Amino acid sequence: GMRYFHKQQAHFWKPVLNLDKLWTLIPEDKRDQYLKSASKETAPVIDTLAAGYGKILGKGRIPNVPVIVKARFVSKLAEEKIRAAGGVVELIA
Amino acid sequence: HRTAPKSDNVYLKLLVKLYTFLARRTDAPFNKVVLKALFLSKINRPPVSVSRIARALKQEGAANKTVVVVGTVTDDARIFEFPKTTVAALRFTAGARAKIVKAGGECITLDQLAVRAPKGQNTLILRGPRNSRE
Amino acid sequence: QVWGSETVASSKVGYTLPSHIISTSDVTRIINSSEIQSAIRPAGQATQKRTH
Amino acid sequence: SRPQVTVHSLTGEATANALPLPAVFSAPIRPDIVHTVFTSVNKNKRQAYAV
Amino acid sequence: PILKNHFRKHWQERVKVHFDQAGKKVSRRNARATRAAKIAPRPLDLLRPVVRAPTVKYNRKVRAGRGFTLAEVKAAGLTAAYARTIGIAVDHRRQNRNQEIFDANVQRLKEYQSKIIVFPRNGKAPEAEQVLSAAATFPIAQPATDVEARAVQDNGESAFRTLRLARSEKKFRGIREKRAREKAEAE
Amino acid sequence: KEKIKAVTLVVASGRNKGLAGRPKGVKGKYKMVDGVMKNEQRALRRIAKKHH
RNA sequence: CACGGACCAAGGAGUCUAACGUCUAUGCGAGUGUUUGGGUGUAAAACCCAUACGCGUAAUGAAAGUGAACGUAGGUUGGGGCCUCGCAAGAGGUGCACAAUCGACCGAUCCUGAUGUCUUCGGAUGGAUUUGAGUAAGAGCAUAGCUGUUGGGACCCGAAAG
RNA sequence: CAACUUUGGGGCCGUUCCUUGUCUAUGUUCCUUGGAACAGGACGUCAUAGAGGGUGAGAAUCCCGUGUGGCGAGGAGUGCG
Lengths: 93, 134, 52, 51, 187, 52
Known about the structure:
Number of helices of chain C: 2
Subcellular location (chain B): Cytoplasm
Family (chain D): Belongs to the universal ribosomal protein uL4 family.
Subcellular location (chain D): Cytoplasm; Nucleus
Shape of chain C: elongated
Oligomer: part of a larger assembly
Main location (chain B): cytoplasm
Structural class of chain E: mainly alpha
Protein name (chain D): Large ribosomal subunit protein uL4A
Shape of chain E: extended
């Protein structure tokens, strides 16, 4: 396509994450209690950026347990699925 | 039609000695199939995920049979629930092993299987996929 | 401590012990289970006789 | 249980204290894997030979 | 398939084969040791600051940087010329543009000045029984960005609309700026 | 840049053989032969015929 | 036909490697890889290790980008093996892997064009086919081995030359 | 303008580095062979010394060294007591 000379491949780190895995980020001792205890006001929060995952993709389905995610980039369906399970997304840069 | 496998894992060879015993004697089809399966190579003994076990358990009239995978067993992070079953294979990943015991079920080796169900009784076999390879 | 157990894992980062693929080394115990001997269709002889 | 072991003195006797095993001893025996490792380790104290 | 050698050239001369590895390691460990016996009570390494790294692929991280700044160390209450002797790096061509980092660095410096004893130039020089790494003693940890548990709050935009619309107006502001120019240049 | 641009054959048997110099028989050109060249050039005549 | 061979000893010719590929063995498994390197030591060994990084778990398009479940992860057929009945022989239910077939989803292409809008932006919803090595509940990482491809001096000796 | 703070320059002995010296245990007992014992057999000893070498053949224990330590001389330049 159109060229931009000395292109340096760091704009394009976009490690994807599907909605499937998404509790391996959480350690087990937290994971089971937060697998139960599906209230609001203990909303287990997730830093995909800290785990090294840039953008969310949706392949999977998730329980209705509400969980908060931090990311930059999302797809529409994945966000809608989150809203259905009662978790919310908050965009960090 | 092969005679004896390519490795020298001694324990597997003892196991195969046993299954030769059964497929010589009893004439079930079951022992033949697992023995033939053990002679395969590693690609052709693919790994089977516990989600696939759960789909097979979700069969009609299938909750109380024992599943068999011949090969190696994986964990799968995707399912969250899992039933409480009696499961047999050669090699168990620890995550999946503990997943099963967390469900409450039992994980066994094939000597223990052959103790319990020699003839292939109340049993069924799975096999993982192969078409993911080019 | 150093090689793990059922109680205490390895003393080592991200390690478990191995596992067996067969519980018991000896097969002949298995074959002389009462249940398998009941389950078996009976033997040959291991010496065939010279016929013609 | 881990069945027991005896313990000995220097001069040697059945010291009355006894230990259980650590369950590595009930871990397997794979001589193919020992051997194919042992080649590869015993190779590693090697230094060059060239012309 | 396409497969690439670079072996067309006279490569056999210029081959460099690291058998030298443990011998070098031992030489090195001896360097460390005798540096210690030269510098006897000091740690073999300086105190180094905490810096948030560049290049958004990495910019979540934080790293053991080079040097505490003049502003930081001034607010700690002590000069470059003294700090460099006390064991403290200083990088002068750096600027402080995050107060969080600023207070982090100065907390690190205060913790240093608390954790030390300084033999003066006068004399008797008590026994001090050295420790051999500043950065181990004064670790450099990624902070807590968030508390583990929260309650949900929503505003109903759902953030895909925001991302799409932000990218769109980013694409179209300059053309909308040209239309604004045309609307301003009308009569 | 453009301006800058610019016989006596001998069957080599008997006495003449192994002489890395000249034989008795002198001329400014000279060419020693043994039978292996006859084999070689026979083979080359064959293969060039097969190349035509 | 032609070429080599007087006679004996000793020497002597598909090897070492780099990047890939298949097959197999082993480990481990949504992961995997300790060895650039730090500590440690009976010292080039052995043992332990964070933080990283690769390769993989997601493609698609030239890009901007966008990013995979209507379902019980689908329907039909076959489908080993199990289960039930059957003295059996046989029937029926289940039917993994796999194959075919029809669909669904993602991406690309064309049209449609909703709540709204710097009134030109956004892109709801539904259609049209053609396409991917996709998805459709993962399978790969590392090593060694037998090996093959190409380059390196390249199975060994040998060539007019600059 | 305001107060505060801090100063160094040698020689001597040890230490350090280098070079070097020197000292730092244990059978040469018996039997057989054979030219000879370092071989074989028996009984012993030492070990932080069984690494190597020699000596009339494979020598821990005949020797030199090694291992662990210590007593020195010469230089250097001060890392500090």
